[PDB]
Every structure is written in structure tokens, then in C-alpha cells.
Design a binder for these strands. Structure first.
Ligand SMILES: [Mg+2]
Ligand SMILES: [Mg+2]
Ligand SMILES: [Mg+2]
Ligand SMILES: [Mg+2]
Ligand SMILES: [Mg+2]
Ligand SMILES: [Mg+2]
Ligand SMILES: [Mg+2]
Ligand SMILES: [Mg+2]
Ligand SMILES: [Mg+2]
Ligand SMILES: [Mg+2]
Ligand SMILES: [Mg+2]
Ligand SMILES: [Mg+2]
Ligand SMILES: [Mg+2]
Ligand SMILES: [Mg+2]
Ligand SMILES: [Mg+2]
Ligand SMILES: [Mg+2]
Ligand SMILES: [Mg+2]
Ligand SMILES: [Mg+2]
Ligand SMILES: [Mg+2]
Ligand SMILES: [Mg+2]
Ligand SMILES: [Mg+2]
Ligand SMILES: [Mg+2]
Ligand SMILES: [Mg+2]
Ligand SMILES: [Mg+2]
Ligand SMILES: [Mg+2]
Ligand SMILES: [Mg+2]
Ligand SMILES: [Mg+2]
Ligand SMILES: [Mg+2]
Ligand SMILES: [Mg+2]
Lengths: 117, 154, 116, 65
RNA sequence: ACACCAACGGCGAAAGCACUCUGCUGGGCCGACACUGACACUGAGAGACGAAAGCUAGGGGAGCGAAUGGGAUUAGAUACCCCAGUAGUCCUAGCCGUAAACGAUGGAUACUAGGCGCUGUGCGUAUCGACCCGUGCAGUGUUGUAGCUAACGCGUUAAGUAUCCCGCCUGGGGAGUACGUUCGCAAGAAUGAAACUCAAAGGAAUUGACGGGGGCCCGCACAAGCGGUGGAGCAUGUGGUUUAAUUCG
């Protein structure tokens, strides 16, 4: 739909799921891929594999737009942090920078308590 | 088996064709240790399979087994209080075992008259990729792949 | 005795003793309480009664009740009690069964997160 | 904008060296242990526990090796 | 609310105090004779401060989150888990005065091995400025001799050897309750019994047994196979009933 040569890939990795969005430097969202939107549900939705297919699935549409270079944004503690990167690589798209954006409060909102499980 | 592991046993050869393979099959078809009868059954099977088709049965073995050999299956693991079906990959000996087995079972359940006939029929159908023994393997693959997400050793 | 427990076999056996109607009913009650709540798991209830002492033999008047439970999955629930009266004995065995039972329900039926 | 970890891939790129460079960057800032730490709330006690444990762990790992 | 710094580090009487900065101020410690000349130590009553929850009045309200509600789980689940979420948490001005307010160790003084450490300063050395070294103090941490202790342990920061002052204890329940007073807006706090009842209640260490605590390892124990039992008929042993007896074990 939009043919953009260089843009950025945000990959949010949480413990229950990983979202992968594709955007451009203008700060504009083109297309996104979620591990849940690939036909995975709650357990499997966290596994590094569902993150793999999520990444592959976004980069499908990004080569379909014909884009070449990208930056990678990794936000959050989950498993897909490592998994997704692999698919970004094997999907044969040039990797410019890989950054970690996981937000670290410098002090702040007092977290929920500890689950007694 | 907690301590000891298993030594390897001499792989024999079927008398007529000098195969490791055919010998495997006659040992697994065996009941009440009548080897006398089992050989007869297996050979009248080679005879019905040379009857129906003019292709070399020695090869139809290789096709029958290549056809039913699963490369993967699952196994039930207990991981973190969660019971998973984890798709463990299969060794070659185990593959041949599984193979001959599903063959033999699907052969014992057939509608036919003899065991020779049944075994021949299922060898024919498995070599064509046309039968229950194959379908079974594809099911094992279907239920492996759906569970593909649970192999963390991937 | 119970219908919700109809799937359970109540087997009541005097060893050296004669069984009455009041022992019948009392057994059904006290074992009934223990079993009724955990009935989904329970299978067979084996209760043996043993009397000793007084006029029968040497030693105090002991009456001793042994029960045994089986569950669909877990085998072997054993309880042994010694006391004064049959009634007392039974009350005791019930007290024990209850505990072991709900210990089994506790283990498996908790969705216990057992990680290892 | 902001960043924690900067991994710049050159055109010698192969997957495994990249993946592990990045993995050691994350080990280096300690970010995943960090977000397992701020997931829930800790009273001062589990903070003193964590300090003694981790600090004396890496410290005795420095004094043994 | 203050990441990294942060440390078995710093100050404080204790409670506690940490992003940065400035201002008003409390102590501490050290070196010099500069001075006074026993002015000391403790403390019944009394006074001040005193975590958090709580309360009165006014603000404030992101996150979290009693109560509360829904969703589950479970025999039940007024709980654990999830989804929401009010008091409260925050500020100003007060009240409350309780905590495992713990070093479970009242204070002061004197005196009795070391080893290894840190913080502050002082001296001599090293250079002529940072170390460096040896040392003098003041505090703070870990091993340990004498000696102490029921053991564990404590050991110049004593639980050692002595002197002085203060508080407290005199078997366990009943009970930190009742009654009465004092304080408090209340919640409550402080002071604190007796009848009655028991022959125990407690501390430290030991051997076991146990643990839905660890670590190691075995067994046809599970897995992987092959064949059975449970269903059908009979053969047979026991229980139950029956009987004059179904001998007893
Ligand atoms: Mg999860
Ligand atoms: Mg071994
Ligand atoms: Mg101090
Ligand atoms: Mg000052
Ligand atoms: Mg004078
Ligand atoms: Mg006083
Ligand atoms: Mg006050
Ligand atoms: Mg408060
Ligand atoms: Mg109130
Ligand atoms: Mg909440
Ligand atoms: Mg509710
Ligand atoms: Mg909320
Ligand atoms: Mg106030
Ligand atoms: Mg007190
Ligand atoms: Mg005290
Ligand atoms: Mg030095
Ligand atoms: Mg000193
Ligand atoms: Mg000490
Ligand atoms: Mg010591
Ligand atoms: Mg003492
Ligand atoms: Mg008394
Ligand atoms: Mg003790
Ligand atoms: Mg043990
Ligand atoms: Mg053990
Ligand atoms: Mg066995
Ligand atoms: Mg053996
Ligand atoms: Mg088995
Ligand atoms: Mg039978
Ligand atoms: Mg006799």
C-alpha cells in the first residue's frame, strides 16, 4: 500500500505475548503482527516459536511493500526478545541497528504486590 | 534399566533373501514362537505381491517402510506443574520399529481371508502411500505440529 | 446409607465379633461423613472390627477398628485405631480417614503448581 | 528518543554472532533480571536480602577467581 | 516515589534519615595547655520525642490497595489466583503513644591476648603532593586466647573481673482479663487483681521417626515392549446368608 524503503520494527516482548509492529521514521505505523493474531492462544502465545512466526508474518508484508533497511526496537522482558531477532535476520532484510527500549523507571509507581502462589 | 544400558544384539539375516529387514518383519509377526509358520506366511505374502505386480518385492519393502517411517512424534512431559505434549524426535531404530508395527497392526485388522493376503495388501497400499499405516503416521505428524510450540528445546 | 455413595462398596467385617444393627447404622453414619464429601475419589471402604480383653482374653477391653480406602487413582489408605468402645473406635477411624483423604484431594486436586 | 542497549550490525552480518552480541549486551545492563525485579513489590527486607545475596555472590566470585 | 552510585558503607538518643541545591540550626570527633577546678554518674516522681495502622478539620487523589463486587478453583472457599475498585497511602494543623519499638543485651567507670578489616582525623616516614608505610586516638565489622555459661555461645563494642544508681522477675492456666481510677474525640492505652484449677508449663542440646525441605543412588517401580486379570462359562478358596452341623484356624 505504502512503499517505504527504510523504517523501524518495534517488537514488544511481554510474558504472555509478543507484538511486532512495523513503522517508518516519521513515527508512522504501517503494519503489525501479533502472536495471537497468528492463531495462537494463551499458553502457546508466549513461547518463542509464536514470536518467530509473528516476526516472519510481519516481514512478509514489509517485503511486499518493498522495504530494505530497518532498525529493531525491543521492549519488554519476555522470551521473544531473542526469538524474533532470528526471524528478522532469516527473512533476509538488512539490519541497521538493534536497540533495547525496555522502560526502566528511575523510581516511581509502586508495583502490584507479590502473588502468593 | 536405571543403571545398565543395553548391549547391541546380532542383526540376523532372513534365509532366502539375506536381509536385515525381512528378518525384522518375521520376528515381529511371530506369535507363540512358531517361526516355522511365520516364515510361511511372510513368503506366501512375497508370492501374492509378486503375483499382483511385476515390480521387485525387495524394493516394495523399502517403499512400504519409507512410507510409514515417522521422523517425529510427541511425548508427555511434566513441566512446571503443566502437562505438555512435547514433540520429541525419533531415532532410526525406533522409526523402523514403529513402522513395522503400524504395518502389522493395520495388517491384522484387515477384512481379508489369510494373513499372507492381508500383509501383502497392506504392503501394496503402504508402498503406494494409499493406506491406514500411512494415515496413522500423518496423524502423528499433525498432532506433533499442532504441539510444535511446546518443544522449548527447538 | 447413601445414594451419592452408591458407587462405593461398603464392606463391613467382624473378625472375632458379632455385628449388630446399631453398629451397622453407626458405621454408615461415621464413615458416611468422611466419605460423602470426597465421594468422587472414593471407591471401596473396608472396615474390620476386632475385640479383645474383658471376658474374651487378657488385657484391657480393647476394641480395634481398621479401615481401608481405595481411590480411583491412588491406592492404599490405611487407618488403625484402638479404644474402649466400638463407637469410640469408629469415631476415631473417621477422624483419621477424613484427614488422609483431604490430604490426597489436597495433593492432586489442588492444581498444585508442582514445578520440577 | 532513548536507548538502553546499542547493537549496530555491520555488513559482515551472520545471525548467531549478532544474536549473542545482543544477548551479552542485555546481560551487561541486566535488564531482564531488572524487569523480573520490578514486576512485583518488595518491602525493604527482600531488598536487603537481594543486596546481600547478589552483591556477595558476584563479590565472592571476584575473590575466588 | 527518587534507578545506577549502595558497601558485610555514613549520621542520629531512639524512632528513622538518600535525585539536586541553598539557607537556619543540633550534636560528634581529633590536636594544642588557653582556661575553670570535681562543676561527676545515675534517676523514684515529671517532661519531651516516639514506625505503621487509627482519628478530628481542610485540602489532594496518579499508582497501589483493606473493605466491597464480579470471575474462577474447591465438597464448600465469606481464602490463596484473576478483573475491577472505596477508605487509606500524600500535604497542612492536631490528637493517639502502641510494635519482634530487637543487639530479644539499662547507664557510667576501671581493668584483662591476639589475627584480619573499614570510617573519620593526628603524628613520624615517603616525596617535599597522591599514595606509601608504621603508629596515637574515636567509632564500627568479622574470627578467636584467658575467663564466663545449662548448653548455644559471649569474648576490649563482653554475656569476662569489680564499684555505683535505676527498672524489672519470683511455677502454668485463669490474664495482661475483671473491678476501680487516670488519660483519650473514639478506638483504646496506662495501673493491675482474686476465686478456681493443674503437677506440670518452659530453655538448650542428642538419638530417632517424619517433611507436599534439599543432594546422591538403586529396584520389571515407572517408562519402552509382549501377553493376561476385570466381561463369558465352568474349576476352586474366602466372606455373607442358611442349617441340627455347615468343626477350628
Ligand atoms: Mg502465562
Ligand atoms: Mg548414574
Ligand atoms: Mg554512630
Ligand atoms: Mg553542622
Ligand atoms: Mg586555682
Ligand atoms: Mg521514670
Ligand atoms: Mg506527641
Ligand atoms: Mg501514618
Ligand atoms: Mg473508621
Ligand atoms: Mg488493582
Ligand atoms: Mg467475591
Ligand atoms: Mg486500578
Ligand atoms: Mg500529623
Ligand atoms: Mg510494649
Ligand atoms: Mg523489651
Ligand atoms: Mg593500601
Ligand atoms: Mg576502641
Ligand atoms: Mg557477632
Ligand atoms: Mg568471637
Ligand atoms: Mg548471662
Ligand atoms: Mg499462679
Ligand atoms: Mg527447641
Ligand atoms: Mg530426610
Ligand atoms: Mg528427604
Ligand atoms: Mg512388580
Ligand atoms: Mg531382574
Ligand atoms: Mg509398562
Ligand atoms: Mg471372571
Ligand atoms: Mg484354637
Amino acid at each position: 500500500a505504502r512503499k517505504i524503503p527504510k523504517g523501524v520494527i518495534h517488537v514488544q516482548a511481554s510474558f504472555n505475548n509478543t507484538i511486532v509492529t512495523v513503522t517508518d521514521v516519521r513515527g508512522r505505523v504501517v503494519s503489525w503482527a501479533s502472536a495471537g493474531t497468528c492463531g495462537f492462544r494463551g499458553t502457546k502465545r508466549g513461547t518463542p516459536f509464536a514470536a518467530q512466526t509473528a516476526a516472519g508474518n510481519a516481514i512478509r508484508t514489509v517485503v511486499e511493500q518493498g522495504m530494505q533497511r530497518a532498525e529493531v526496537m525491543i521492549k519488554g522482558p519476555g522470551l521473544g526478545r531473542d526469538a524474533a531477532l532470528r526471524a528478522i535476520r532469516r527473512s533476509g532484510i538488512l539490519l541497521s541497528f538493534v536497540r533495547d527500549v525496555t522502560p526502566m523507571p528511575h523510581n516511581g509507581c509502586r508495583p502490584p504486590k507479590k502473588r502468593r502462589v | 534399566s536405571r543403571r545398565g544400558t543395553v548391549e547391541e544384539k546380532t542383526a540376523k539375516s532372513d534365509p532366502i533373501y539375506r536381509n536385515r529387514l525381512v528378518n525384522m518383519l518375521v520376528n515381529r509377526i511371530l506369535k507363540h514362537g512358531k517361526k516355522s509358520l511365520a516364515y510361511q506366511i511372510l513368503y506366501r505374502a512375497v508370492k501374492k505381491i509378486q503375483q499382483k505386480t511385476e515390480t521387485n518385492p525387495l524394493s516394495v519393502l523399502r517403499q512400504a517402510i519409507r512410507g510409514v517411517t515417522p521422523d517425529i512424534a510427541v511425548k508427555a512431559r511434566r513441566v512446571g506443574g503443566s502437562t505438555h505434549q512435547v514433540p520429541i524426535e525419533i531415532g532410526s531404530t525406533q522409526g523402523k520399529a514403529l513402522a513395522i508395527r503400524w504395518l502389522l497392526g493395520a495388517a491384522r485388522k484387515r477384512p481379508g481371508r489369510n494373513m499372507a493376503f492381508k500383509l501383502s495388501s497392506e504392503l501394496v497400499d503402504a508402498a503406494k502411500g494409499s493406506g491406514d499405516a500411512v494415515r496413522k503416521k500423518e496423524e502423528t505428524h499433525r498432532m506433533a505440529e499442532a504441539n510444535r510450540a511446546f518443544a522449548h528445546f527447538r | 446409607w447413601d445414594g451419592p455413595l452408591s458407587s462405593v462398596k461398603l464392606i463391613l467385617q467382624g473378625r472375632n465379633l458379632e455385628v449388630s444393627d446399631n453398629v451397622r447404622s453407626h458405621v454408615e453414619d461415621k464413615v458416611g461423613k468422611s466419605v460423602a464429601k470426597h465421594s468422587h475419589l472414593v471407591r471401596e471402604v473396608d472396615v474390620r472390627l476386632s475385640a479383645r480383653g474383658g471376658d474374651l482374653s487378657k488385657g484391657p477391653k480393647l476394641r480395634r477398628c481398621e479401615v481401608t480406602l481405595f481411590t480411583k487413582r491412588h491406592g492404599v489408605i490405611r487407618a488403625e485405631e484402638d479404644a474402649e468402645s466400638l463407637y469410640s473406635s469408629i469415631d476415631l477411624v473417621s477422624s483419621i480417614i477424613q484427614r488422609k483423604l483431604r490430604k490426597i484431594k489436597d495433593k492432586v486436586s489442588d492444581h498444585g503448581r508442582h514445578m520440577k | 528518543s532513548a536507548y538502553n542497549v546499542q547493537v549496530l550490525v555491520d555488513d559482515n552480518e551472520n545471525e548467531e554472532r549478532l544474536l549473542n552480541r545482543f544477548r551479552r549486551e542485555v546481560m551487561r545492563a541486566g535488564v531482564i533480571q531488572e524487569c523480573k525485579r520490578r514486576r512485583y513489590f518488595e518491602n525493604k527486607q527482600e531488598e536487603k536480602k537481594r543486596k546481600h545475596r547478589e552483591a556477595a555472590k558476584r563479590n565472592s566470585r571476584r575473590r575466588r577467581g
